[PDB]
Scaffold this active site. Structure first.
Site, PDB file in Angstrom:
ATOM      1  N   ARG A   1       0.838  -1.186   0.000  1.00  0.00           N
ATOM      2  CA  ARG A   1       0.000   0.000   0.000  1.00  0.00           C
ATOM      3  C   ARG A   1       0.879   1.244   0.000  1.00  0.00           C
ATOM      4  NH1 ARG A   1      -2.219  -1.361   6.076  1.00  0.00           N
ATOM      5  NH2 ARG A   1      -0.755  -0.094   7.312  1.00  0.00           N
TER       6      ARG A   1
ATOM      7  N   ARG B   1      -0.023   5.801  -5.867  1.00  0.00           N
ATOM      8  CA  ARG B   1      -0.493   4.431  -6.059  1.00  0.00           C
ATOM      9  C   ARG B   1       0.269   3.728  -7.190  1.00  0.00           C
ATOM     10  NH1 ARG B   1      -4.706   7.646  -5.148  1.00  0.00           N
ATOM     11  NH2 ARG B   1      -6.420   7.107  -3.741  1.00  0.00           N
TER      12      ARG B   1
ATOM     13  N   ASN C   1      -3.894  -1.827  -5.183  1.00  0.00           N
ATOM     14  CA  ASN C   1      -3.471  -0.687  -5.989  1.00  0.00           C
ATOM     15  C   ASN C   1      -2.149  -0.937  -6.723  1.00  0.00           C
ATOM     16  OD1 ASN C   1      -5.453   1.369  -5.836  1.00  0.00           O
ATOM     17  ND2 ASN C   1      -4.831   1.829  -3.724  1.00  0.00           N
TER      18      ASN C   1
ATOM     19  N   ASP D   1     -14.193   6.851  -5.158  1.00  0.00           N
ATOM     20  CA  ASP D   1     -13.995   8.283  -5.467  1.00  0.00           C
ATOM     21  C   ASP D   1     -15.340   9.000  -5.621  1.00  0.00           C
ATOM     22  OD1 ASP D   1     -11.909   6.473  -6.816  1.00  0.00           O
ATOM     23  OD2 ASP D   1     -10.807   8.356  -6.671  1.00  0.00           O
TER      24      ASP D   1
ATOM     25  N   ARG E   1     -17.096   9.420  -2.254  1.00  0.00           N
ATOM     26  CA  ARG E   1     -16.449  10.543  -1.569  1.00  0.00           C
ATOM     27  C   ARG E   1     -16.923  11.892  -2.108  1.00  0.00           C
ATOM     28  NH1 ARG E   1     -10.621   7.562  -1.789  1.00  0.00           N
ATOM     29  NH2 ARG E   1     -10.462   6.891   0.402  1.00  0.00           N
TER      30      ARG E   1
ATOM     31  N   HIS F   1      -8.582   5.591 -10.636  1.00  0.00           N
ATOM     32  CA  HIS F   1      -8.675   5.699  -9.194  1.00  0.00           C
ATOM     33  C   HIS F   1      -7.338   6.252  -8.692  1.00  0.00           C
ATOM     34  CE1 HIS F   1      -9.665   4.915  -5.057  1.00  0.00           C
ATOM     35  NE2 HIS F   1      -8.529   4.257  -4.919  1.00  0.00           N
TER      36      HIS F   1
ATOM     37  N   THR G   1      -6.139   3.469   4.458  1.00  0.00           N
ATOM     38  CA  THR G   1      -7.614   3.541   4.381  1.00  0.00           C
ATOM     39  C   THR G   1      -8.179   2.124   4.421  1.00  0.00           C
ATOM     40  OG1 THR G   1      -8.270   3.493   2.001  1.00  0.00           O
ATOM     41  CG2 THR G   1      -7.207   5.502   2.839  1.00  0.00           C
TER      42      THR G   1
END
Ligand SMILES: NC(=O)C1=CN([C@@H]2O[C@H](COP(=O)(O)OP(=O)(O)OC[C@H]3O[C@@H](n4cnc5c(N)ncnc54)[C@H](O)[C@@H]3O)[C@@H](O)[C@H]2O)C=CC1
Ligand SMILES: NC(=O)C1=CN([C@@H]2O[C@H](COP(=O)(O)OP(=O)(O)OC[C@H]3O[C@@H](n4cnc5c(N)ncnc54)[C@H](O)[C@@H]3O)[C@@H](O)[C@H]2O)C=CC1
Ligand SMILES: NC(=O)C1=CN([C@@H]2O[C@H](COP(=O)(O)OP(=O)(O)OC[C@H]3O[C@@H](n4cnc5c(N)ncnc54)[C@H](O)[C@@H]3O)[C@@H](O)[C@H]2O)C=CC1
Ligand SMILES: NC[C@H]1O[C@H](O[C@H]2[C@H](O)[C@@H](O[C@H]3O[C@H](CO)[C@@H](O)[C@H](N)[C@H]3O)[C@H](N)C[C@@H]2N)[C@H](O)[C@@H](O)[C@@H]1O
Ligand SMILES: O=C([O-])C(=O)[O-]
Ligand SMILES: O=C([O-])C(=O)[O-]
Ligand SMILES: O=C([O-])C(=O)[O-]
Ligand SMILES: O=C([O-])C(=O)[O-]
Lengths: 331, 331, 331, 331
Positions: C98, C105, C137, C165, C168, C192, C247
């Site tokens: 991550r 990413r 990712n 996304d 959000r 993303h 996250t």
């Protein structure tokens, strides 16, 4: 090009066989209550309704479809023809004869048998692998009838049985004790309705047996007359009928709970009507309610409740009476 | 000691202080569809039912109570007397005559205004801080009537309105595009009835305007006849009434949807009947559907849709029809 | 005779396969948030977990199993060997490195491609008919990789993409407008990541175009500075990472929302990573988010969003950034 | 002038005071597992988080908020200051040191008392009418401490207690019997820890006493070694802690289960930490798990379990161990 083609670029067509399909037979009040309860618990990815009354059937379908925005069951279908029921995991039968002025328990059952001789072969033709849940009354005899006509092994023919009787018992138990029915435990077994058996010995809250605190519970020697609670279970259907014409909501919720265990392979124990030959001295092909483990295969197991000799004799008597009737039927 | 006393040690005698109580007035097809939908969505800690037919009322209550085991709403009460409705957060009025096949909802008004004159004062007496959710037809007119009899401020008087018409619309859109109704957006505003307005400009999937793709959308020269979708929305109630004699399930779910937003303070936007004096040149106390923000205080806000002058005219035309009827009513 | 023998009578020995099985590969923060979200949404009858860290894998399995009483997913299994994964309908991949504070990413490609070369063939071997849902990712690139390695058709390889996304964005829109995100509509497409594209032209509440109300929307000289809303969407993961390290909850929920559509065949529209070769001028095998109809066969359809030339250029930029990385891969 | 005002016409300014606010204190593994479980069960209209680590707190809050679209809890707030906790119906305390691999929960007492000395007065200042649900270890002792410090009546101070230990016990029962935990009934009472008490005499499936069928159940000579099941229950946390570092999911779900009974006033029975002076021979202010009726006012009643004198002596020993520690504490 069409609006749809301008908006949407298709990747592939060709549907899949439906994965979690429930069918309800009979769109009278009981059937519709089962349907709405099933829709609101997201138990099916497709719901088929079938009946002979073409207008009501279509109307009920349309009215449910108009609520699709508020549901998570993306295909609702209906038709008089049983092809709409194909590839159902679970088929719920609520269809039956209506009673008139009299007349004869035998006569009544015979008219349901006749109705079942049409319905049941149609169901098995289109969903040979389904579990059958029989809700129509008299349920214990009609579960037998459906078993006989379908040729299904006993694990896939289930009668709602004393499921509702037991949930009613727990409600009334809860009312008296000031405890939610979930935390009140208690079983009503054997024949649905008049001759059901309240198993006083299993009555408990938090595992504390009411019978231990109160040895005379349920007998004529207790001042609190808990026998009256069982009477109310037996009588509550009659009172509801007398007051509003029929029962529907509690049967619908009760049935959705069985469907949940079946569709989700939960293996919870439910009081449902099952072929009990070889148990409690019973030697005839009869269905009565005992606690059963419900799953993807229907009834995989049943619990052998320790019954007193009095309780065994009540179940035996019930079995005799049921067999007395079934012996005379023609299919 | 009573068995209950031997089993259970009381720490306090509580009070009957429900925190999220809903009352449903009228326990016919619509009332009970609203009730079961509410019960299965855990929107209330207490459900009160009221009606003038006492045996029906008691029977429906009992039937719901027998399903308590399968619910998380611990108190279900009822009675002809409104003291059972006290301290309701939300009171849902479903009482009155319904349209027969081929009959306008506007033909119900005199009969149902009379029953609102009975009902509404009795609900305000026992729940002065509730929100009123009006379902009886003609729902827009009867929202005004409820507003007028109650003396409630306009935020706390809400008609189920076009929440259902818009749901039906999105279902039909959904069927045409092969897309779930959740992801089809489109709005029907105005009267819950024949003069409802389909807002073609707002119809979309993933935010792409259908009118932009297909400029002849919902017009006469529309080769795809999208105007027929709105027609079908208009005719949907009559079609369901022709087939099964009434509508219940879809409105039951619509009402639950509205109840969810109110009780959980969601601030979702719904097309519900509200006072729109001051918008679109309307200058009388007309109620009809425009998108509203719904929450704990009922309607907190109105969304101002950008209407074409034709749409705006439709809406005004509808307003004047409704005011024509309302102006002659006396309280 | 065992206690079990005495208590329970067995009818059925055989055990049919799980009907609605889900597998989550990687039981770190994301994997377990996906897990718990899926369990609380009753989307599976069996949950399989896989990781290379045996201790942690078993610990997480046991912790979930201990909560079984509160769930309705009766079989929870794990193993380092992919045999536990067999016959999965949906396999969700969350394994891998991550990004740390400040890290792109896209900086994770080499590391996570190499992990995918081991994971994907093992998934395919045991669930050849599954839908692959990629979360690791960079999700768009790794979906491409998963497609190429698996040999699956593109409909069955889905990246979680911009579902998050977009959620959000709608949350932030909601915070600005005083409206629940459910009723705020706005789409974020493409990568993303940093090159994601806010489709201003599609933003709406109740079908009313914000852009039409506010022509400066999403422009540099917008007094309300709505570009900042998209900025916050781009920056959100980076802020959350620097505050709590990673996250998990939001992606957990976004993943469950996608799994819900897939497992229940809902045909809802989600912005998810898919091959968009041949639209918006894109000639290469780029994967990025566009709105897709999601169901039992994965992505059955794409929505063709009507972008402004600026919106399209940003989306084209996004595809170029991504293909630039894809172009130099080895697997 | 603003987009908002062009879009939305406001009716009401007034608002505030949610109906169903829940606070979680401590946003570590336990707190956040409670949070997500509570959110996904729609138990709250507002969720407040508190922790002493500010960056961590904000990060966790933001991560949940980003999933708002997928939840029906419209307000999620956090702060180091307890003002954000104002007016909570329920406050869940998870903050504290957790036991290491080779470590008794009882070794945590001094550290977590220190923490509660700061936390509890701050909680009660802002929500004087809440119910306190204590999760921090050792949970029984800290429930006593919470009660002492707060000044609350004992009904409003509740420890998560053996609700978890009993779920684990039922899971393991279910595994041995081939039955869902829902249908396996067995109670673990007393300390949430090493001196917990398996109530062998109340264990049943469908009201059938396991101890009567198998009299050696729970004894040393039991050929099936059922005592090992309770040993597994006692050891389960340490086993999970050894494997993954801590426990989180099951306690989250267990706490969500307790929260659901309280917030919805269900009056279900749960084994939770409460003051048991006066019962089972216990004469001191010890807090221990016994079955309690949970509802809107916390613990309204407790069920007196008819333990065997063997079982009662074990509970008494659990009481004695806990008092040994309690009696040394400083306020
Ligand atoms: N807003 C909407 O979209 C919809 C509205 N409706 C309307 O809902 C209303 C009810 O429809 P149904 O339930 O099918 O009719 P129904 O005849 O099944 O039930 C009406 C109930 O109202 C009761 N009632 C009459 N006067 C009363 C009084 N003074 N106090 C309390 N209860 C009283 C009746 O006793 C009866 O139980 C009708 O006006 C119908 O048109 C129906 C469907 C959708
Ligand atoms: N698409 C999206 O929106 C989001 C993506 N992510 C991504 O999800 C991924 C996972 O993140 P976290 O769970 O936070 O990391 P983590 O470090 O907590 O967990 C990752 C897990 O994958 C496991 N793993 C590593 N190699 C493996 C293999 N060959 N087979 C099976 N398992 C293996 C690790 O042992 C570890 O338990 C990262 O790439 C992260 O950047 C994170 C949040 C949102
Ligand atoms: N009752 C039960 O069944 C269970 C209890 N627990 C217990 O719950 C507690 C929490 O465990 P985890 O969440 O795993 O630990 P953790 O280390 O993940 O989280 C503890 C949190 O408490 C916070 N904290 C410490 N002092 C504070 C203060 N004065 N004010 C506000 N916040 C403060 C820390 O900042 C940290 O975020 C431990 O005592 C653990 O033993 C854990 C599992 C089950
Ligand atoms: N031709 C096809 C078949 O059609 C019927 O099947 C239907 C039953 O008849 C229904 O029940 C009826 O029972 C009442 C008795 O009073 C009738 O008056 C009333 N019409 C009905 O409600 C039941 N709910 C559904 C079932 N599919 C006949 O049974 C069957 O022999 C015949 O082959
Ligand atoms: O069988 C029935 O109709 C019942 O018991 O409600
Ligand atoms: O109002 C009605 O009857 C309807 O639309 O269902
Ligand atoms: O990709 C991520 O980490 C995210 O957006 O949460
Ligand atoms: O208390 C604990 O840590 C547990 O039992 O999970």
């Amino acid at each position: 090009a069409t609006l749809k083609d301008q908006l949407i670029y298709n990747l592939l067509k060709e549907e899949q066989t439906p994965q979690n399909k429930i069918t309800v037979v009979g769109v009278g009040a009981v059937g519709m209550a089962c349907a709405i309860s099933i829709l609101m618990k997201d138990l099916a990815d497709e719901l088929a309704l079938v009946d002979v009354i073409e207008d009501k059937l279509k109307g009920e379908m349309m009215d449910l479809q108009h609520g699709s925005l508020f549901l998570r069951t993306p295909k609702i279908v209906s038709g008089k023809d049983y092809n709409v029921t194909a590839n159902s995991k679970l088929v719920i039968i609520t269809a039956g004869a209506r009673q008139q002025e009299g007349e004869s328990r035998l006569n009544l059952v015979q008219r349901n048998v006749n109705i079942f001789k049409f319905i049941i072969p149609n169901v098995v033709k289109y969903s040979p692998n389904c579990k059958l849940l029989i809700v129509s009354n008299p349920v214990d005899i009609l579960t037998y009838v459906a078993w006989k006509i379908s040729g299904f092994p006993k694990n896939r023919v289930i009668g709602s049985g004393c499921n509702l009787d037991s949930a009613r018992f727990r409600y009334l138990m809860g009312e008296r004790l000031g405890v939610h029915p979930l935390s009140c435990h208690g079983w009503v077994l054997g024949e649905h309705g008049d001759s059901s058996v309240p198993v006083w010995s299993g009555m408990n809250v938090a595992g504390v047996s009411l019978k231990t605190l109160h040895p005379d519970l349920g007998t004529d020697k207790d001042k609190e007359q808990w026998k009256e609670v069982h009477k109310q279970v037996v009588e509550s259907a009659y009172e509801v009928i007398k007051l509003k014409g029929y029962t529907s909501w509690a049967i619908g919720l009760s049935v959705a709970d069985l469907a949940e265990s079946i569709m989700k392979n939960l293996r919870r124990v439910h009081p449902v009507s099952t072929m009990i030959k070889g148990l409690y001295g019973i030697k005839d092909d009869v269905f009565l309610s005992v606690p059963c483990i419900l799953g993807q295969n229907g009834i995989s197991d049943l619990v052998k409740v320790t019954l007193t000799s009095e309780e065994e004799a009540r179940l035996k008597k019930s079995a005799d009476t049921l067999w007395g009737i079934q012996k005379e039927l023609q299919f």
